[PDB]
C-alpha cells in the first residue's frame, strides 16, 4: 500500500521467537515422547536428571502452510526488493495483513518445503567475516528428493552438482574470486547436526550427508536410519519415542536451501560445512522479509 524507505533486520526479530515458541508448543501437543529426559540443576555443579514418562501415540505428521497476521493495533511490513541481504534499508515496501504460507518443517542441514528465491541464489549472514555465524542459502531452483522406509533417499546427482556449483559461485561473489570453494562434511558433534535429520510420517530420519557435502571445483543414494532416541530441539535433553510404524513410510520434499558454516583462518581456501540445529534460523528463512511495527 504505502511506499517508504524502511530498515529491516532479519537476524533480530520477534516473529522468529514467537513462531519458535508456537512450533515448540505444536510439537509438544502433537508428538508425545514415551520417555522425556531433562537436566535439572541448582547451579551447584551436580545436576539431577528428571525423567517424565507419558503415553506416546503414533500420529500422522505433515507440515501445513501457516500464514501469520498482525492483530488490531499492529501491522506487518514486507520487503519486495529483489536480492535483499536481510539487513539495512528497503526502497519498495508493502504493508501486508498476513504473511504468506510457511510450512513448519523441522530439519537440519537442509530446508524442505520452503520458498525459492525468484531471480537467483541468495546467501545471507549476520556477519560474513564471522565464522561462528550460520549462513542461510536460498536457491532459485528446487531439488526434489525421495526418502523411503528403512532409510534410503534417492535424489538427482546432476541437479545437486550444478546447485553446489552455483552456490560455490555465489560464495566466490561474497568472499572474493581468488578463493577456492571446497565443501566438506560436518566437523562432528551431536548426531542430529552431523547428519541430515528430519521428521517424516511421525518418524525421525537421519541420513548421511557426506555424499552431498563432499565437493570440489574440479542418482545419489543417501543411507538413512530411524532413531527412536533423539535430542530434543525444543529444549536441551534426550527423548525416546515409539518404534516406527509398519508399512511404507515415504516423503517427497522440495529443497529450497541449505544452512552452511565456514571454517576459520589463510590460505586462499575456504571450507564450507553443513550447519543447522537452530530452528530459529529455519523460521528466519521464511521470515527474513517480514517485520512487526505498531501503528
Amino acid at each position: 500500500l504505502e511506499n517508504v524507505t524502511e530498515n529491516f533486520n532479519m537476524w533480530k526479530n520477534n516473529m522468529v521467537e514467537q513462531m519458535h515458541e508456537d512450533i515448540i508448543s505444536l510439537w509438544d501437543q502433537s508428538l508425545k515422547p514415551c520417555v522425556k529426559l531433562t537436566p535439572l540443576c541448582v547451579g551447584a555443579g551436580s545436576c539431577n536428571t528428571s525423567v517424565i514418562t507419558q503415553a506416546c501415540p503414533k500420529v500422522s505428521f505433515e507440515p501445513i502452510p501457516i500464514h501469520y497476521c498482525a492483530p488490531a493495533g499492529f501491522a506487518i511490513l514486507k520487503c519486495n526488493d529483489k536480492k535483499f541481504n536481510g539487513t539495512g534499508p528497503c526502497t519498495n515496501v508493502s504493508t501486508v495483513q498476513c504473511t504468506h504460507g510457511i510450512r513448519p518443517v523441522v530439519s537440519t542441514q537442509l530446508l524442505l518445503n520452503g520458498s525459492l528465491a525468484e531471480e537467483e541464489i541468495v546467501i545471507r549472514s549476520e556477519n560474513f567475516t564471522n565464522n561462528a555465524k550460520t549462513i542461510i542459502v536460498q536457491l532459485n531452483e528446487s531439488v526434489v528428493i525421495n526418502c523411503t522406509g528403512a532409510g534410503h533417499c534417492n535424489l538427482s546427482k546432476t541437479q545437486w552438482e550444478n546447485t553446489l556449483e552455483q552456490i560455490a559461485i555465489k560464495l566466490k561473489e561474497q568472499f572474493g574470486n581468488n578463493k577456492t570453494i571446497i565443501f566438506n562434511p560436518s566437523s562432528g558433534g551431536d548426531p542430529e547436526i552431523v547428519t541430515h535429520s528430519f521428521n517424516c510420517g511421525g518418524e525421525f530420519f537421519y541420513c548421511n550427508s557426506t555424499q552431498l557435502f563432499t565437493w570440489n571445483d574440479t542418482n545419489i543414494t543417501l543411507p538413512c536410519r530411524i532413531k527412536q532416541i533423539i535430542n530434543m530441539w525444543q529444549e536441551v535433553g534426550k527423548a525416546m519415542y515409539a518404534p516406527p510404524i509398519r508399512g511404507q513410510i515415504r516423503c517427497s520434499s522440495n529443497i529450497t536451501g541449505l544452512l552452511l558454516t565456514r571454517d576459520g583462518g589463510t590460505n586462499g581456501t575456504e571450507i564450507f560445512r553443513p550447519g543447522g540445529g537452530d530452528m530459529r534460523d529455519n523460521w528466519r528463512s521464511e521470515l527474513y522479509k517480514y517485520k512487526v511495527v505498531k501503528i
Partner: antibody
Framework: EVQLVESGAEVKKPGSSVKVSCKAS????????FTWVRQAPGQGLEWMGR????????HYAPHLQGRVTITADKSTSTVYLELRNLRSDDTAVYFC?????????????????????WGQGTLVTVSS | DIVMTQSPATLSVSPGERATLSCRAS??????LAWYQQKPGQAPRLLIY???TRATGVPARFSGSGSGAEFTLTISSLQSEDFAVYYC???????????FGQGTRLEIKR
C-alpha cells in the same frame, strides 16, 4: 549367547527389606531391557516391573508402586531388585528376565515388553 | 487394568494328538501377545511373541494365532517334553502395565 545368573535364596522377617541381584553376560548390557517377574508357589506369574537399561528408567506395577525399586549397574552388568516392607504374602520365587531391544547406543529401541531370556530364579521367604 | 484369562484351566490330551489353548483379554491388546512355557522347578520359556511369530529355539509345531481380545496357541503334535504349564502376556499398553494369564496346564491323557 545369553547368560543370566541370579542371587542365592533369601530369608527375611516381616517388615524388613530384601535386595536380590541378577548377573547378565554374553552380550552388551545397555542393549537389553530387564523385567522382574515373581511367582507365588502354586500360583501363576506376576509382573513386578521393567527397567530400561540405556535410559536408566524403571517402571513398576501399580500395586507394588513406591515400595519397590529396580536399578541397573552398567559397570558390573548387574540388575538389582529391591523390595521394602515385606509381608508374608510376598513369599515367592523371583525371576530375573531380559530381552534384546536392538542397538540402544545407535538410537534403535524396539521397546519390547515380552521376555526372551530368563534367570534361574531366587527363592525369597518372608516369615516370622 | 487388562485382565488375561486362559481357557481351559486344565486340558488333558493324549500323546500324538493336537492341543489347543485359548487366551482372552478384558480389552483389545492388538498385536501384542506373548506365549510362554514353564516346567516345575524351572523358569518360563519364551514360545511366541506378537502371536504371529515363533521364537528362536522353539519347535515349528508351536503356532500362535488370533488378534485383539482373542488368542489361540495350537500345537500340532504333542511330544514328551511338550507337556507343561503355558502362560499368556499382554505388553500392549503404555505407560507399561503388564499382566499374565492364570495359566493352562497340559496333561497326558491315558
Amino acid at each position: 549367547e545369553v547368560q543370566l545368573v541370579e542371587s542365592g535364596a533369601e530369608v527375611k522377617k516381616p517388615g524388613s527389606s530384601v535386595k536380590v541381584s541378577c548377573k547378565a553376560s554374553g552380550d552388551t548390557f545397555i542393549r537389553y531391557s530387564f523385567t522382574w517377574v515373581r511367582q507365588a508357589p502354586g500360583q501363576g506369574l506376576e509382573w513386578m516391573g521393567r527397567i530400561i537399561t540405556i535410559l536408566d528408567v524403571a517402571h513398576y506395577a501399580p500395586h507394588l508402586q513406591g515400595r519397590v525399586t529396580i536399578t541397573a549397574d552398567k559397570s558390573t552388568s548387574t540388575v538389582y531388585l529391591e523390595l521394602r516392607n515385606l509381608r508374608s504374602d510376598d513369599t515367592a520365587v523371583y525371576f530375573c528376565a531380559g530381552v534384546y531391544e536392538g542397538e540402544a547406543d545407535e538410537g534403535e529401541y524396539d521397546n519390547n515388553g515380552f521376555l526372551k531370556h530368563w534367570g534361574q530364579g531366587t527363592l525369597v521367604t518372608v516369615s516370622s | 487394568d487388562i485382565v488375561m484369562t486362559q481357557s481351559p484351566a486344565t486340558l488333558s490330551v493324549s500323546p500324538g494328538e493336537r492341543a489347543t489353548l485359548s487366551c482372552r483379554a478384558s480389552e483389545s491388546v492388538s498385536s501384542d501377545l506373548a506365549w510362554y512355557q514353564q516346567k516345575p522347578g524351572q523358569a518360563p520359556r519364551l514360545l511366541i511373541y506378537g502371536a504371529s511369530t515363533r521364537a528362536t529355539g522353539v519347535p515349528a509345531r508351536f503356532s500362535g494365532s488370533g488378534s485383539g481380545a482373542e488368542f489361540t496357541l495350537t500345537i500340532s503334535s504333542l511330544q514328551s517334553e511338550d507337556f507343561a504349564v503355558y502362560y499368556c502376556q499382554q505388553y500392549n499398553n503404555w505407560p507399561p502395565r503388564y499382566t499374565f494369564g492364570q495359566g493352562t496346564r497340559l496333561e497326558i491323557k491315558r
